[PDB]
Amino acid sequence: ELQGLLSCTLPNRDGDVLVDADGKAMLFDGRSGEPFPYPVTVGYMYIMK
Amino acid sequence: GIVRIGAEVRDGDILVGKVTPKGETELTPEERLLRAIFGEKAREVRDTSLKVPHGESGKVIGIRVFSREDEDELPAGVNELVRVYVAQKRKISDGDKLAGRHGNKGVIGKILPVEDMPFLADGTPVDIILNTHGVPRRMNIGQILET
Amino acid sequence: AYTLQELLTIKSDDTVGRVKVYEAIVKGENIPEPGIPESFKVLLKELQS
Amino acid sequence: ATCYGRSMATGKLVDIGEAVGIVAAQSIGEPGTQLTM
Amino acid sequence: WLSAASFQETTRVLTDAAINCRSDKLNGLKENVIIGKLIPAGTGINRYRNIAVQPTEEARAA
């Protein structure tokens, strides 16, 4: 069910689906600028202090 | 002699001023010479005032005070008692301990500027970067599913 | 050896050596020679007890 | 020093002042929490 | 006897040492640690701790 939901991801405000069905996404290195070569798993997690 | 509500105090600042009757034995030769020359034998005290501990600062929130002149319950020989409450707004910092719900704990090594942070295609930067090598060997895959 | 002696004598127990060390560092002089740990005197007195 | 052998950390011949007894005790007892039935 | 008393079974060691009127030579790592003396190892060995240092005459001229 999680695998299926990873495909139904609604786009953002610009119509782009930022996260693919593997849960990964292409990120850009904010220091150099070149995009990171491989897709990296991104998402939202509950973090405590 | 009490700090004022709302004041900002730092390490070593005085919160409540207190003076204690000074023991005659510990009078240094210089103090003895002065008290014998001028004869100022009036209201002899020493500084035992409350101070702020090391590594502690913040805004003073409230002050509660109980006196013996006013009818309050205090232990034997205690004339006055004053509590001062100090609050601090602690932002997240290096070395502070974060953790998820799956046993994945960690302290904060570096907080990068929002530009140094890797960002998605539309420019949304990530908020926290968890290393990969930690995940598979602890046997908490629930964090990946939660993500 | 000198580190271990400094840790156990002039940093912990020497009552005349710690003040001497502070006085020597304040005036920029060399560190003096350590003395006798006071806890050893306490051990001797407790053995006498 | 000659009968003992080289020093593991330095790789050269063990110096004189070295206290090899405590080093040996530490070396034997440090991976002690790894022995299981 | 000091090392044995600090290690384990202090009461028995102390009784036995008092009966035999034991005099500790006071030359051991733990002994020198307890009494606050330089330990007989490493930089505490006589040949290392009593080294004399002075510049050479050729360098003392310059």
Place this chain on the structure above:
Amino acid sequence: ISQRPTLSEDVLTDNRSQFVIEPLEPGFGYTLGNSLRRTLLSSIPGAAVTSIRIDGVLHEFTTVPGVKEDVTEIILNLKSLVVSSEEDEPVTMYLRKQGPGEVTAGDIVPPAGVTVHNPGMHIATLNDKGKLEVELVVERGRGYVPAVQNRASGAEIGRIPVDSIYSPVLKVTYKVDATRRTDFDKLILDVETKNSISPRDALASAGKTLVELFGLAR
């Protein structure tokens, strides 16, 4: 051979704009887009509130009678104020209000040279007994400046320092198009600022900053 590059602006909304830079060297669009985006996110000058002052309170951790939110929650609401100031000096705004009703940014009376760009933002909710009287010192700077302490300045007990977020831009990103005998890259910046300034002004400020910085290279 090298054709002189051009910068052509597109517009999506009043606060968001796409820019197109072309032609560029192959593999050169990513680096330029990043060197622009970093300066856009970090060092764009703007204006924000530095310290506030409420009459009935002497510190941040208390409650104003009648209002619904505590002073700390009120400050967290004021953290969302987008303002623009031409004075470039400490200038004081005022706000008097009495309930019932609700206090918003439109109820604040800004002095000359400054203006609030979202009057509809919620600040506090007042009742019959609620009375809100606030002064807000507004200044102009860049980046993020944490609350200036009352020990650093000659401030007094009533002054409540607040965090200052001087960034006028909201979200910056970029994308490149590579084209492979004649290879070249076309860069597309996407800049969304707050209603304080237009993306044209933000990108112009970043361009001047980077020109001034690279001028020492020659």
Place this chain on the structure above:
Amino acid sequence: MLISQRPTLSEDVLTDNRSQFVIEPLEPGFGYTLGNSLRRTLLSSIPGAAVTSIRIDGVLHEFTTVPGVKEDVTEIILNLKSLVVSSEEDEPVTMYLRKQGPGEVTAGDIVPPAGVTVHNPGMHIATLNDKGKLEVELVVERGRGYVPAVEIGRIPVDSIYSPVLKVTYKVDATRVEQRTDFDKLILDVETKNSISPRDALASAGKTLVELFGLARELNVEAEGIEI
């Protein structure tokens, strides 16, 4: 806005064609805004002339055997790609290298046509043994950066147009007693014999000044001042 000052630039000369440069102090986060851009500009945006394609007589189909010399065609191309040359003709210009008899051919044995200049005459090319002769054609033209291999007897080579060879940067932290987190940029550059690292750095600076002046032209507005 605000005012920043004292962003000095200094140089350490290791060799005549290689030097380090230090930009300090830079504001927080600006060590990486300048670092990658300067490197990519030095590498890919500088005008320079180099070899594009060549033709070697004697053997054309085998492409691996050549009489008179022991070096293969691969090593010949390797020796040729490292030849530094500067041309001002926009059109591709052909040069020729001819040498007979046993001996050693250098880059000075080449006859440069009008306009072009070879800067490494002492560079080794090939060695002719007994009864050997070498006659080769070269195509030299201008460009920027680096481009891979793009009439019988013709072979294209890898054109190294960039007058710089190797550029690498690093970022450290030195600042005032209030921040201690400002950035310092260290840029190690190693160039060819065409231009010194100084002139390459100045050219990259001018090209980037033009690039970002394209954006500054949109409006004359406030930004960080300098001293």
Place this chain on the structure above:
Amino acid sequence: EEVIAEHPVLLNRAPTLHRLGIQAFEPMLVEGKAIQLHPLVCEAFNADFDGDQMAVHLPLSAEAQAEARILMLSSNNILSPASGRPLAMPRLDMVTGLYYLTTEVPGDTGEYQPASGDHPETGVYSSPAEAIMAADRGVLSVRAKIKVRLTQLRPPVEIEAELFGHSGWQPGDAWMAETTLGRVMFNELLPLGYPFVNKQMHKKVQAAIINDLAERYPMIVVAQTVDKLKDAGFYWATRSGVTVSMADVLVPPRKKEILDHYEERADKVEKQFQRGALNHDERNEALVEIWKEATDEVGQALREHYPDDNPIITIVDSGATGNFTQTRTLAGMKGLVTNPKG
């Protein structure tokens, strides 16, 4: 900042199991309230960053400061005094960073391909700077096999014996090498004198390299080489593309059939025990052996179904961290579980 310069401090973390639990460092003033600790000394301290605290002692006397700078300095103690193995060696992240950096991918972009017809090879490069230029452009991959002429690197024993005079080499001597740009850049960290490796850098290989460096080269050379290795390993671990997702944790495809088969075996064992033929302890031992076999079969099936570039397999097999039983437990089957008696 003036009084701190060249005044070493002692860092200790309990439990101090061996003498490396206390080490001398040069203090550098940092912002914050945390002690920044070099990532290589962790193996000596058994220190992770899950909330660990360390203590700092300040030597005062000249003899104590000398003992700190000489006897207890961090860069002086690189080898375990127990087995002589390297402890300041790249540990886990760095490992992957180097394991990805030196492995050769057959058929990558820019890979050397022989000349066919009128098309040249385009697999040779004059200098490693030319390879760096070809890598900045999208043509050359770092993990692709190419042929480079190396002027500032030392060749192996056989290549130096064939092409050059044995024990004779000079900086600037040229030689052809068919390697990856990654292996070139990795050998660039190792000193000039060290022979080229051209091997996939499993953790054991770098352990052997550091053993050789400590056996032959000075201690300070090793202390700088390990720092260069740390930097390279981290930089390339960022770009090694190792993450974790639910799709990267692949369930074995034949798990259902294997479990059905071995549970059928166990059911036959239970049927045999139902008639009283099989002994109780014999039944327990038989079921234990059955489920051990099934666990290992599921592990083998998982090892077969997993690509060799999977991030889990890459992390485990590179020697960075973890073992294969953890992977068998994560995806596949954990197996038998302990009892109160054992």
Place this chain on the structure above:
Amino acid sequence: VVVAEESGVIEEVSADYITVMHDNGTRRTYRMRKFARSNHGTCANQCPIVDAGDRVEAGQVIADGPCTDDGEMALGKNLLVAIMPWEGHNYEDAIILS
């Protein structure tokens, strides 16, 4: 957390207390713990989650506590996480924050 003991309409809401008016005419008032120190130094602070005039049922949450958000235990924050090694600043269980 603050829970309604009896159904009714909220009569007044302040940062200090919440006064509700039951259906039988009786009043009730709940005082808010504001910036109260805990046994371990954490801050116990309560904030009303209802507005004046709302009709609440018996047992509804009227004000949130320290780690409560509209009625549920909110012990932390939802953060955008990317899982990748980054320049060793997340080496060995260290964490990198934006």
Place this chain on the structure above:
Amino acid sequence: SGGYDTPLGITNPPIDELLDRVSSKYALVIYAAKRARQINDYYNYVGPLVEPGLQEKPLSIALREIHADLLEHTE
């Protein structure tokens, strides 16, 4: 000079070059410590024998002197 790169102020002179001056690391420690407190006695007794830094720890000065072989020692 050797293949080692430039040390960084506290790791110089390299320990591999200083251990060639004495028989053991302990003797080197005592060597440097006695020379250093002798130096500090001079400032309040001979030396420094090399050019001192603008502000330098006397231990580092003694280490540089030992590296320069400008002094003798006897066990």
